[PDB]
Design a protein around this nucleic acid. Structure first.
Ligand SMILES: [Mg+2]
Ligand SMILES: [Mg+2]
Length: 739
RNA sequence: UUACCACUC
């Protein structure tokens, strides 16, 4: 493994588990005659709990024990109803190590029992403590603390991963929300109530079970009956809840699920609070915890487990013993890179942020702007004028030459007026390089119309600027510089670069966009390089339409990218590096076994072309946290920290990278898993190439979480899936029009 | 869109 970097003393949120047993014995059971119910099998195995011992993990046909029984054992048992004799035979199958891959499930069951005996409650998959709820009465909210905990196996052994998680609950019932909407709205209250109810998840506090309501029933009432018994008697018998008023509607969830609203409480952060800033600033102050508080919470959980004798007894029945502190590993801090502009290059500073340097000095490639149009409304003449003025002053240091725009004043802020004016100027003047539009307020339909026209119907680059951004006089130079850089990227310019250390290399990045209603046309983006310096990009989009498979179209994208690379370079790439992002944890085998070999066959179209290839799988939603071990307490790790041991997977070759700057909280790295390495790349070269590619995002002067092409593909898929609903025009795919 | 870490009924 790699050895380049500074040795950084790191701490983890993982607690090591020591196994005191020597082996775990797997047995198979047979029933004669046959018995189908699992409960009956457990009852017979419970009569046979004797002999077999009192520590059992039985799932229906496979039995796990910690005691070595004979090779074959026969037992006779009494059937409950027929009063018959049933023979149960238990036979050894194989001997597993305590830290084996097949022991994880029933170990997780044991740990669920352990945490349940600590008075904790299970909502979803995490364990929350409702007695320590923290009430924001100013907002009528409750924050329930808890942990997401699971036992896993890694190269370094058996570990328990625990992460602090908070749940948001509403103090008021959903019936109270219904009454409020009925109060402030008289006629349209049904539609608004349905709109609020559908997306939101709901719980029931008497049983702490979560349902996702999709519809609301208006006709039935608690007085009615259901599968024959009534709701009121049912609830007053099972729980004795005295219902105050019985005129309420019902709630319908479909996987029927019929719930009452007085007994139902919504979840999730409120919709209104997201737009508020003071509210979210306070909630962020309360929820996100520093590394010191996170470690304190983990230590508190461990202390709580240790001080409880029954919880520890449930673990030591299998010879397991949690340690008294988190696991401390050693990571490496990777060396920094040189960011190159046209005439100067700078050592990236310790902050991994270079916003000033880009604005000060010139870019690799600049496209002169001589013919461009500015479409501004009646009430933004002044600010718009001011904007243009600054665009002329800031342009010189960057090295851009911009002429005055073609001023077009829109007589009214109607969407059709915008579209007609833009189309008319497009038709009359065929030379306009860029259309800049100024919009009043928040209008998403206008944005959709503008981008649909400029990207699909008529292929011209477009930019949208909101009046609030350019209205504030104090912040206009800085925003003008970023706007001009974005326009330069859209025209086909090149801003900065890094020194790529492998020759004849082509980088491909993919990412997948899923609709919030995921049963839709899922979009897969594709961004590849067509330049030796990795500054030009060829981008395509493919859709998951029914009755065909996506890999077939990915082949067309790959072969087209190869042809464009040949046009630019008069050769074909020796090494092709593919960054596959967006795949879940349960499809790694599917991607590695099927998709990558399928793509590899497209290369036969070019005669006698066998490229070396490295394929990665990128995962962002990991639950591992890193801490830096300062002499005083736990702080944020430095950007650029790599971990390649003691938490990696034992099946693949993989590593964890932290490349961005965490302003507050514990760092969450990115997991890179290599499924194909035909090029025989050393691990260190893989790590440093990924870290370099994290610097090539031209829409943010600084390092990002994922490689640049993955982010570009994600942005293209998002644009093509939500805003455009259609493939972009082929003419625009040569440049990064989608920024 | 200036741009980013953000066994129920
Ligand atoms: Mg993604
Ligand atoms: Mg943009």
């Amino acid at each position: 493994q790699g050895s380049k970097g500074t040795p950084q003393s790191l701490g983890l949120n993982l607690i090591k588990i020591q196994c005191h047993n020597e082996a775990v014995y797997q047995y198979h059971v047979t029933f004669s005659p046959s018995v189908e119910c699992k409960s009956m099998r457990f009852g017979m195995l419970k009569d046979h709990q004797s002999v077999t011992g009192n520590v059992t993990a039985f799932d229906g046909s496979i039995l796990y024990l910690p005691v070595k029984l004979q090779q074959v054992v026969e037992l006779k048992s009494q059937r409950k109803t027929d009063d018959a004799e049933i023979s149960i035979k238990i036979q050894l199958t194989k001997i597993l190590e305590p830290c084996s891959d097949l022991c994880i499930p029933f170990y997780n069951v044991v740990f669920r029992r352990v945490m349940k005996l600590l008075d904790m409650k299970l909502v979803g998959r995490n364990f929350y403590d409702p007695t320590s709820a923290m009430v924001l009465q100013q907002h009528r909210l409750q924050i329930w603390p808890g942990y997401a905990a699971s036992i896993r196996r890694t190269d370094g052994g058996l570990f328990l991963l625990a992460d602090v998680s908070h749940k948001v609950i509403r103090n008021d019932s959903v019936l109270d929300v219904m009454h409020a909407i009925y109060q402030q709205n008289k006629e349209h209250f049904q539609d608004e109530c349905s709109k609020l109810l559908v997306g939101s998840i709901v719980i029931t506090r008497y049983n702490n079970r979560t349902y996702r309501i999709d519809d609301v029933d208006w006709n039935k009432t608690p007085k009615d009956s259901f599968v024959e018994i009534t709701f009121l008697e049912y609830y007053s018998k099972n729980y004795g809840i005295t219902v105050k008023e019985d005129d309420q509607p019902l709630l319908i969830h479909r996987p029927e699920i019929l719930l009452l609203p007085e007994l139902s409480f919504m979840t999730g952060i409120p919709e209104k609070m997201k737009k508020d800033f003071r509210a979210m600033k306070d909630l962020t102050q309360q929820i996100n915890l520093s590394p010191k508080q996170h470690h304190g919470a983990l230590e508190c959980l461990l202390q709580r487990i240790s001080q409880n004798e029954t919880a520890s007894n449930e673990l030591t029945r299998w010879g397991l013993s949690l340690h008294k502190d988190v696991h401390k590993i050693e990571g490496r801090l990777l060396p920094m890179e040189r960011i190159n502009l046209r005439n100067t290059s700078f050592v990236t500073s310790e902050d991994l942020n270079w916003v000033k340097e880009v604005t000060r000095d010139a870019s690799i490639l600049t496209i002169p702007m001589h013919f461009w149009a500015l479409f501004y409304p009646k009430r933004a003449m002044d600010q718009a004028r001011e904007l243009v003025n600054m665009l002329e002053k800031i342009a010189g240091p960057i090295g851009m030459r911009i002429s005055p725009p073609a001023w077009v004043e829109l007589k009214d802020d109607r969407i059709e007026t915008y579209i007609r004016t833009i189309q008319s100027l497009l038709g009359v003047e065929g030379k306009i390089q860029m259309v800049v539009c100024i919009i009043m307020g928040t209008r998403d339909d206008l944005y959709g119309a503008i981008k649909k026209l400029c990207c699909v119907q008529s292929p011209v680059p477009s930019q949208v600027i909101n009046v609030r951004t350019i209205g504030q006089p104090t912040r206009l130079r800085s925003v003008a510089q970023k706007i001009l850089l974005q326009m330069n990227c859209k025209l086909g310019g090149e801003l900065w670069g890094v020194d790529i250390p492998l020759k004849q290399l082509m980088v491909i990045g993919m990412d997948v966009y899923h609709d919030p209603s995921r049963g839709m046309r899922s979009v897969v983006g594709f961004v590849a390089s067509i330049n030796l310096t990795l500054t030009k990009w060829y981008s395509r989009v493919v859709f998951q339409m029914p009755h065909q498979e996506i890999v077939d179209s990915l082949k067309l994208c790959l072969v087209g990218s190869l042809k464009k690379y040949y046009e630019v370079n008069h050769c074909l790439p020796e090494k092709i590096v593919v960054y596959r992002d967006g795949v879940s944890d349960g499809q790694l085998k599917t991607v590695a076994n099927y998709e990558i070999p399928q793509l590899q066959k497209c290369f036969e179209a070019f005669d006698n072309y066998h490229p070396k290839m490295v394929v990665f799988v990128v995962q962002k939603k990991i639950s591992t946290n890193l801490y830096l071990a300062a002499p005083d307490h736990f702080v944020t790790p430095s950007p650029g920290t790599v971990v390649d041991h003691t938490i990696t997977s034992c099946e693949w070759v993989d590593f964890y990278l932290l490349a961005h700057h965490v302003r507050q909280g514990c760092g969450i790295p990115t997991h890179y898993i290599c499924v194909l390495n035909t090029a025989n790349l050393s691990p260190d070269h893989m790590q440093r190439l990924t870290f370099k590619l994290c610097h090539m995002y031209w829409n943010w002067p600084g390092t990002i979480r994922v490689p640049a092409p993955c982010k570009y593909a994600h942005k293209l898929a998002f644009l093509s899936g939500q805003i455009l609903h259609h493939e972009p025009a082929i003419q625009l795919c040569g440049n990064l029009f989608f920024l």
